[model samples]
Target: STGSATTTPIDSLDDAYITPVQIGTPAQTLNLDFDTGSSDLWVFSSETTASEVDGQTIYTPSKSTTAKLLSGATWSISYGDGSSSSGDVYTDTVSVGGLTVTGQAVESAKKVSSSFTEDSTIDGLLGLAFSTLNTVSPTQQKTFFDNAKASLDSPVFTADLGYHAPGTYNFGFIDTTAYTGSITYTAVSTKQGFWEWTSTGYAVGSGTFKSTSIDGIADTGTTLLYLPATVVSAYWAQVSGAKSSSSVGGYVFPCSATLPSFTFGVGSARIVIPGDYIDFGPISTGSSSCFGGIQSSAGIGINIFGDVALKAAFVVFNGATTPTLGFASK
Candidate 1:
């Protein structure tokens, strides 16, 4: 899927979303992104030279007395957005919410992009999706689930986005209060890293279009949703006064009014995307028109449903019960 480039403010410390978890026996605290897109826990370090990082949040071990560093082991991760980071391994006692998981692995980036180095707000990313994509090997690594299993009151990590403020990342057990009935479950594939699935169809306003029955994947690693050419065209056609214009890779729409509400059918589930989600903040393009979330990616091989889609549903990373991935309503 095509990723959106955002330059939003990181001004509110309250706006910094993270789940607290334990790192080791002593139990320390760390801020992390509960990313369903990828499986990895990484943080910036004090060892990083000033030049290696510019626009990201750096985690200083000195800030936490319980932090511990691994003697050997290094890492480098490259995102699809052309951003990359490299650093050493470390272990520490970490905490999120009231839960504490031990011996957590962390990466201390020695080299990172300017966007990742500029701010000193976020401590690291806590991957809570699938174990197949785990950066830390199973031999020496233990995820939040691994350590919290025996200790958590419910032995589950829940992600609540709708009622929680934007960027809010919660941990621990699934809050049943958020839902009214039994959760829906989707079997997980043995595929490596991230969750992959097939889409059945899509609906715009009152119109529905079935897919060609092609396989589709759901990725949290990506920020924007990418669809098949046929599906994209079919969807935009329903929006009133929607017209295409040139962008970095292809065309985007300039609609005179709000686009129709759209729903994506993933197997038995029908995920709806609110109209406002498609209407993005306006860019100064000689008009007062707002940018829609949908973009043109006719040739992209796979369709990726990003956070925009995930936010609308209750996703379950049931790696604990089986290799299965489940989706339910909040």
Candidate 2:
């Protein structure tokens, strides 16, 4: 049956959102972090060590009658956030909302890093990235969305992430009611397995929009927006009390300080981020100083348009053709 479903995004420690998904025969549910940056559906399973298993609900493949092990096949994945997981591969039925895919590749983790262990809420990661990025050994694997696209009425999905609130992830459909105004279309560069796009220019505060070209990736799993160091330094200059603090790692300003709005150009479409949204909250516990959500994308080769940036608007991801992305103010 060709249909669509909407899954509510569960707020992570104020960092990212996890989408609920069901797997196996009786539908073992798990809150997964839907990542568009990487491709691999690795979950905390029975194989995970006791120390590695925190409050997360492990998926027991043995309990699923339809689950099948690929004998010698294995999978490993690492993220920019330093989170990593590796495990055995199993083929099982997986469903998101009302969309279901048969024989989906499920990576049951044998080992997970401290990053995943500490995030007790996230059971695993459901990668929405390109199929080419899958890490399954011997034979590559296809993501859930990729596996189900053929049966979908339309091969598209929309990520509507809100700030500190619940949002909806739509599969195979775009809900017009979720977004206001018309969506601005931009060709995506999927050469890197990410929703990569180019920006015409950007500006800090109420200053004139400069003609600077920026190439970045739209990552739903990342918490903050990351740009180049030079652009970040310029934004800090706009804030009177803002400064680079070694104690905080990024730029920090007084909580009472007024912030400037940041803007990005998408062809003729200009996306602006209000100053209030840029205040990522206090840098530490009991601290009156707050950190800017926008920072430098150093070390990481690509600039990341994380939740901080994505929350400003409704984003449509089209993977059917050349992978174009649509954006509209909400």
Candidate 3:
């Protein structure tokens, strides 16, 4: 079977993308962040504290006759960025774009962090990473993709994340019409439970490609692209007014500065991100300085090819026995 769904960005800056998911018996539809960096099909639910709930919708398991409490099962997950959520687990019918998975492990959030409470655009996150990364205790639960893998026509999923417009996520089959040019396939390292791969090199606009191997994860959950300090510095140096400011954090340049495009290699293929996409909007409302979409990974520990990079190309999270990633121009 195949599942195809549309995902839309939250705002102009494309802070995050949200996709509608149907959870429980009667299908309580909730808009969730389809995160490829983490594994856990969790959601905001009726079990959540009233105080923790703001403008977001909640899934009430009580309303779903198919809901079955996983007695002793519980889960807690904390993002590296401080946002977190913990909850009880339930097995219910979960569906995404008509691709249904019966008895899917559905984590109902009981408590959530202020960051989640404030982001009303998303009700929760649907982890697309390996199930081994699931945070459930006692007995770990499988991710939705893992559970649906056997029943799918092919074990694969693709992330067609957009910049400011709507994008798509396709399961079980590749949508050839969604991308242009031939796909460049590369091996993936699931050792860290992420869609991690190493780029051949990178280059700033009109510059020669550097011969360096930069390893990072393709994370849809992240808003910006982060690379090694060396690459970031090189790119910023080309901008006349670009400066690495601690007060403002990371690299910031004059709003009017002409930014250069960034290109990264996937095997012999190169994907170019336009300069306008790199000028992530102003640091503050009406500010003259704009924050860069590409930042340094110095303190981040690991580099990330987030939305800023993904939006430049089509990404395939092939779930074969020996998983591989495919990148193609769109």
- Best model per lDDT: 3
Q: Which ten residues in a row have the lowest lDDT in candidate 2?
A: 4-13
Which one is best on TM-score? 3
The list of candidate 2 runs beyond 4 A from truth reads 1-13
Give candidate 1's error at residue 302 in angstroms. 3.3
Put the candidates in lDDT order, highest first. 3, 2, 1
Model 1 RMSD to the real structure? Answer: 5.7
Error of 2 at 301 (Å): 1.2
TM-score of 3: 0.98
Instruction: By TM-score, rank the candidates, best first.
Output: 3, 2, 1
Over the stretch 174-280, how does candidate 1's per-residue lDDT look in tens digits? Answer: 55565544566655554645566666677877775565553555554454567777667777787665656665343345645767777877567677777666665
Can you tell me which runs of candidate 1 are displaced by over 4 Å? 1-31, 52-57, 62-65, 118-121, 136-142, 150-155, 167-172, 180-182, 209-214, 240-246, 284-289, 296-301
lDDT at position 87, candidate 1:
73
> Alpha carbon lDDT of residue 50, candidate 2?
84
Better model by TM-score: candidate 2 vs candidate 3: 3
User: What's the lDDT for residue 297 in model 1?
Assistant: 47
